[PDB]
């Protein structure tokens with residue numbers, strides 16, 4: 001039994017509202033539903049990319065190592081190997 | 087949530103010609119009018135489903151992670167909760 005749960009992007013794409021917000025960052029899936037109201041950068045920016053891969057924006061805006069440590073707590077699984085971009 | 091724009095499906099259904107083409111995918115509305123001629127799969131498949139929810143078809147062909155990323159530039163709003171089926 002693998003120690004990691006894998007999610008297809010089709011599944012992630014479904015959680016795209018404030019009720020259940022999932023997001024992909026660097027090949028990993030995060031459930032940031034409860035973090036929406038605590039995000040220093042506001043929640044409109046987040047909701048816009050819910051259900052998607054927001055890796056580019058997360059790096060582009062430059063996030064601190066402190067922000068990256070935070071991420072760890074919303075981690076729920078990895079993107080399925082079939083949906084990774086070689 | 088805050089700056090979220092909502093549309094009724096009946097509003098979306100009015101945009102079904104090459105003049106102004108909207109399509110629903112996973113509960114979100116996309117204005118793909120300018121993408122019609124860039125679509126690797128052709129413009130016909132897109133116009134055939136213009137103004138409707140094309141989630142099943144999009145997902146059945148198995149679009150790539152790169153195809154999913156492209157969606158972000160056509161996003162214009164969400165489908166009203168009351169129009170979302172069970």
Ligand code: HEM
Nearest residue numbers: 025040041045046054057058061062063064066067070071
């Ligand atoms: C992966 C989930 C995310 C977490 C845990 C997170 C966390 C944080 C934290 C802790 C800060 C405060 C400053 C810093 O440490 O850099 C911050 C700021 C910011 N974040 Fe995020 N963020 C996330 C996703 C995003 C996304 C997807 C966007 C773009 C839509 C974004 C845009 C911003 C912006 C613009 C600021 C700075 C706002 C200002 O200028 O004060 N963040 N984020």
Ligand code: HEM
Nearest residue numbers: 118126127131132135140143144147149150152153156157
């Ligand atoms: C408007 C949202 C859509 C976007 C952004 C999009 C994007 C793309 C992209 C980038 C490709 C090239 C290959 C890939 O990256 O997977 C592709 C191929 C294709 N698309 Fe779409 N597409 C959309 C909607 C649709 C719809 C509604 C249909 C009709 C079922 C469709 C049918 C196809 C087909 C048949 C291919 C060719 C696949 C192959 O070469 O085997 N697409 N699409």
